[PDB]
């Protein structure tokens, strides 16, 4: 908020000037009264011109100040929301800030305007007549106590009624969301009875709400009438005494009315400001809670005493002294216990988390030293849970790309992944937009889209896993055939964590891990024709 | 600015 | 159109039982308006008298009496109207909810729950403000205006012509401003919803975004949405201020034209000082009512539209068949399927069943196996009179199932759902769901039939505890055994199991398939594997909608 | 403006 410290200051000037310009209609009015009892037109014309000029200037200044304040507040709100969302996304609520900022800004503006007005009115009244101002100040608190007491009770009753209505609403939505069971058990009358019983409780509160409303209205009217009468009596007696004229009394009466209105507005506005200020601290607290240049990688990776764990604590490690290694141009697969959590190794391959020990340098360079922008487009692959975003298919199949690929390149990537048929069969070509969060997607289509998104970037390492698990048997066979038929076995490194032994049959060197480290391995034929884990799994 | 119940 | 008149008549008829309250409200409103109209006249006469104690005292007393009476009526009317509004709201909600329960299952399969919640929570309140709020303010506001202008014409037949000429320049401006605001608000709402959709999409696909490191693009898209919304916010904030400036300038001008003309008329000799004061008060006061009348008349149409939208749901006709009446005393339990074919109305002309035919017997425990695209669920559902078969017929004891009473049928035949659903009531209320009355002895007997007592009996007070919302505190296996106990508490004659053994114990399934509720009562079990073969007396496979 | 029920 500091960066806009100048503009706001300008606003804080203009309002003050406006608050002095609008106090010319009452004052001169009294002057006109003092003119009508002492009957030239020169003074009348002078008063008229002064009043008109001051009022016009006040209106213009108020307009300009409001424009400046709104323009600044819009930018502040947008910047705050952007920062909040960025922090939330990188951390791994949003609508709360959006619904809070407008209310906070509006209430703060109204509070400032009416506070300045009230200060100016009190000052001019005090300069006018000290005794009447003292009387008004003395009698203000005594006549502004009971209405607040009644209003708090009325507000409590209103909020109770609204909460009861919300409870009944759910009592109804829960019933209506499970219609097949209700119809099956023939229990519609029970639901109707429950709803009626819920409404019979609000029927009781509504009467007291109405009574409180009526009493509050009566109290407000009585206080409003009493306040004015109390000062009118003393003003009349003072005027009759002859110490002051009638015009001064008229000006004071108008000033007192405006001052009371300003005080009442301020009292009505303040609680909302307090609530919004208290609420913004929660958002604040929630928000407040360099690499070497890479050129090319040959696909050679290896690990020595590598360890990784969950972010919750380093004691949830799923690896201990691993020795995984995949040769460039060779495709290999890994196996292990279901509860061992070996899948995190794939995340370790994507540089999502730094190693807890040892090193995981690949292609002769440290793993976390390369640039993040170029590494993510050369070491990633299809995810474990295929999905399609709400963007266009031509953009969904190339998400996270610095430069949008050409139509021919996209078609070639889809064909290499088998997704060309899906693109051709989709209506309106690649310009069609897929449903948000895969609302209308299919397993085979999702697998094809994931494979295309993986292969579009020409990765130097493959971390494809669980893609065929969601895909069909025919799609899995096609993916395996494409992987096996790539030029010179794709001439790159693949470390796929396959779910079926059909893909692991042609593995260059299969391996299985236990206890956080690789415990067995070798050729697939040797593993399946010996005491290895693969043969035991096949026989079992 | 002036207030308005709305 | 005439549709608005029809809706207005329906809304009038909905408030028929509120005559004793509306009469008092419309009496107090008239009293308050008549009291508030006459005060400035007596103020002016007092001012004229000051410039004879009897007349002064009379005027003061009358002014005080009118002020007090108006103050009282202005609160009595508000209380009465608030009570009337509340009554109308509570009356309409019950009718809306009780009309929806009779609809067919396709209506709920099609309509999103968000629309139902919106109708039952928001529009039923908007349509309830029509009579107590809009038709009240409009009436008093218009009447007050008529009275003020009558008094102004009485005081001075010449000065009122200027206000009569000035009024259109205010009416047109208010109309234009309201028209612009009503569309700016909805544009802002649409922009906000579109902005929130981006965050929702980012949340939905978080794993892929973190895997690819594409946060720097989602942030940019969100910033673009925010920058698109900020412009609409600024436009609205500018339009308001412009309207306020125009209003202030116009009023000062009118007052100065009024003040100058009034003074020039008084110095001639055709007017007095109190008369000028009263005329100034009236002319100052008329404008606020003139503006609020336009505001309220513009606002009423939204309530009328909301009422139309609510009434369009409770007037729709259902698709249930003709109600039945038959209710025999002892059902034999023989069920036959004859050339049954079915197509979902939501996705028509894509049949799931093609001439299915089979026969069931009391002791013949028949098992259905085969995936058929999960079509085993459809044959189970239509055996409970939940859907009507488009071809063939299904009959119970040589009579169609649709000919039996709705209340009677679901006592003899009951099925367990594939995914059990539990309600937020107590344990006892869930077991005895749908029954008129039950005894705790039966609940223990029903619970012991499913071995669920091993969990229920550790819990304090036994069966009177509150189950978590939609069974939140229960485990997947625990919910299965609770749903089973909900069936044998009813003593069924025909039993249908939707692969309960997939989560429940196989031995428990055998006991449920061989107890008194299954010794001579027809049992049909659905299995995803050959596990049902160990007891099935008539195994039946069906694929592509055709039986094996 | 001035909506009091």
Numbering used by the authors:
A (entry chain A): 180 to 218, 220 to 272, 288 to 484, 492 to 742
B (entry chain C): 1 to 6
C (entry chain B): 131 to 181, 185 to 681
D (entry chain D): 3 to 7
Q: Which statements did the authors publish about this structure?
A:
The resolution of the 7-mer peptide-bound structure was limited to 5.1 Å due to greater heterogeneity. In contrast, the structure of TAP is heterogenous in the presence of b27″. The final reconstruction, determined at 5 Å resolution, closely resembles that of the b27-bound conformation, with lateral openings filled by lipid molecules. Despite the limited resolution, two distinct peptide densities are apparent within the translocation pathway, each attached to either the N- or C-pockets. The density in the N-pocket is clear enough to model the first six residues of b27″, and the density in the C-pocket can accommodate the last five residues of the peptide. The first three residues (RRY) in the N-terminal binding site and the last two residues (EL) in the C-terminal binding site bind in the same way as the b27 peptide; however, the remaining residues of each peptide density diverge. Either way, we infer that peptides with less than eight residues cannot span the transmembrane cavity to engage both binding pockets simultaneously, explaining their lower affinity for TAP and inability to compete with longer peptides.
TAP is a heteromeric ATP-binding cassette (ABC) transporter comprising two subunits, TAP1 and TAP2. In this study, we analyzed the structure of TAP in the presence and absence of peptides. These structures show that TAP suspends peptides across its transmembrane cavity, anchoring their termini in two distal binding pockets primarily through their backbone atoms.
